[PDB]
């Protein structure tokens, strides 16, 4: 098998929320200058798709030669869990290689999303950092994004999902915003989407006074 | 008989979010006996669509034929608004008919979305309001739900849209819930839908914390 | 073609208020413009009343007539909840059309009516709403209005009465002010007048405060 195929999954974020119709490229990799043609066929389902859609080929710096083919695909498609077969066959290839993508077949799990203060010493610091961990979800495709007013700020970071003993999956996501602005009270919050949560969309509120609502500054003056 | 041809746009509720499908359909009444097959044709944007589908014809106590054809939609398809075309041509009609369907244009507004606790007075009764409004939308597709930490509730109602002195429409929704629940502690989040809302989802939460004492404390001195 | 006489029942805030409870309105559209000729008629308890209120007829482009005309009876009568029927004849109809129109039947309730405070989210915003609901009360009559001693308010929100699960009705009303108006407590109430409240008015002002355990902020004086 002389040519390769890299797959490239529809991102997990991309077919949450509307913003674009999330692609899957069945990239044709270490392609033989010989016979740069290549023949694609299709596997959904036992019928072909009527959208079929094909890109001009590129040539890298080193010997590798790249095929690449987009595709639309609708949100509601990829959650049902159908399946797909990309076939690529060539002249330098003996027989065609297999790579099937098809969502996993697992039982959802409903995860839970929590706050965490800054510490004091954190405090001391100009820069204060927010952390939002989001844990007991099955599947490993979830979202999380810091939303505040406005454009949401790009400085939150997010951890790779890690396994548990439960077989779940547990992350952490952290964003650093100026000392000053925490004193001010805003509002902060990290949407959590997930295929398991309801309307996939769950939002936890974050403020300094939410901590500890405990009454203090008692003052006693006898004469 | 020149059938009377109504049209209905689809469920916002079904159009923002993923999961729920939108179809799109146009409804024919008091169709003559003569010719009870109807033929519908559906356009999109001049371009004919192979996935619209037509149930079949059923009788009903008027005596009148009524055919439905639902043609699915995607989401990105209504948030560009394209104009839809259902054409109904019937042997006994003379001349065929032709509906078009569109999204309204109009500026989008960000809502704002408050909560308000139930009253004094009113918590001395079994049952408990608690009332989540929403303002400021221009568009009048919107779409409330309530909800818990455990599930959703479905004792809510929802009053229909009203103007305003600006224009932007606002509306409440109300929830009764019982005392025993209320008085323990339980959140409560009220969610909109709305097209300028950010990812079509915002979510307001009442943890019944509302009114907290300031932190300082009137001094108590002797004489 | 022919005349079609709309339903447009009394506002009970019209019953209301001693100036128009005799005001009580039939209105006729599509009225073809070819019979000049109207026959209007009431009947009230089911006899005719002697006297009657007609206003000229108004063209409309699309070959229509619209004919509004005014009866004068007492609003006690109309209280009563006995039927009243109005009839429009004319030489297009080839028979008289007879329209009943009375109030709604059923057992009354007394309604509960509740003010709420603005949130603290709401004095980011330069205009501060403020809510006053009523509810559980089954006829559709009602009328809240907004008051306040020093001047009233020419801001004023209602929503239409919806459906409840036990039958009975509920409703808001919004007021928007300024933050240094309900700043410096200024004194609103929200009347609510139904036909089974006693009196026909039940007042429930809204006060500043709170009610948070802390307000003052301000250290107290001992005097023996």
Redesign the interface.
Known sequence: GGPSVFLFPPKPKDT???SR?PEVTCVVVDVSHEDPEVKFNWYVDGVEVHNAKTKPREEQYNSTYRVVSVLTV???DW?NGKEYKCKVSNKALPAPIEKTISKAKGQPREPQVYTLPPSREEMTKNQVSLTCLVKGFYPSDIAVEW?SNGQ?ENNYKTTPPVLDSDGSFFLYSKLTVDKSRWQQGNVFSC?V?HEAL??????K?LDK??GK?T?????????
């Open positions: 949450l929320m509307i119709t609708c949100h509601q959650l939303e949401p949407s989407m309801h309307n996939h969309y769950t939002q509120s006074s939410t609502p009454l203090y500054n008692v003052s006693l003056i006898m004469s």
